[PDB]
């Protein structure tokens, strides 16, 4: 919804798990809207910097994951409508990755770009 819709072009940075592209303002006010329960994106900034990537190539204004071959490719047919990044450059800390694995959420890298 409009809450997930970014408001300005300043300080855009994409998440590492759902590749959600939103500004620091709504990351502070709400954090993530996809895996907030699994990540605790809200209430801090240092861990937000580690759990979000400022380098993303290409974005998609997907709204219908259930009938999108875009969503098929980028494995967000199960996530909500929103703005997602085609490529995300970064990786979670080993501690957070281990925590997610223990909770049963394997971390799949969103870096789909072809490195040479």
């Amino acid at each position: 919804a409009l809450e997930t819709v970014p408001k300005d072009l300043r300080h855009l940075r994409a998440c590492l798990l759902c590749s959600l592209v939103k500004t620091i303002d709504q990351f502070e006010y709400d954090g993530c809207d996809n895996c907030d329960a699994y990540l605790q994106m809200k209430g801090n900034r240092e861990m937000v910097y580690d759990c979000t990537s400022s380098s993303f190539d290409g974005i998609i204004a997907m709204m219908s994951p259930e009938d999108s071959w875009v969503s098929k490719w980028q494995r967000v047919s199960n996530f909500k409508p929103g703005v997602y990044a085609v490529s995300v450059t970064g990786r979670l800390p080993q501690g957070i990755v281990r925590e997610l694995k223990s909770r049963g959420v394997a971390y799949k890298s969103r870096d789909t770009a072809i490195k040479t």
């Binding site: 409009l2 819709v5 190539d57 290409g58 998609i60 204004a61 997907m62 709204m63 219908s64 999108s68 071959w69 875009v70 085609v86 490529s87 770009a113």
Partner: protein, 91 residues
Amino acid sequence: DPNLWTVKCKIGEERATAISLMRKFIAYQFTDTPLQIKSVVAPEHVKGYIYVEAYKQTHVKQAIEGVGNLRLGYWNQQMVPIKEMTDVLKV
């Protein structure tokens, strides 16, 4: 799957046109005239025109009958080749 249509936009203002059209879609999605298009692609290295993901040129026209930046392409639209979806999103 929906097909891509090439619509001409003011040089250097494709991003602004995309933002404006998505804002208008937000404002008019709950109205009696929602936008039936699925998405819009504005490649970083493509200037002069953008791609609209829709099933019909009628849908494309009804979506682009907003800001005047797309007036030149409003008269007619051009299909994107079937093989060209893979190339559309390459960076």
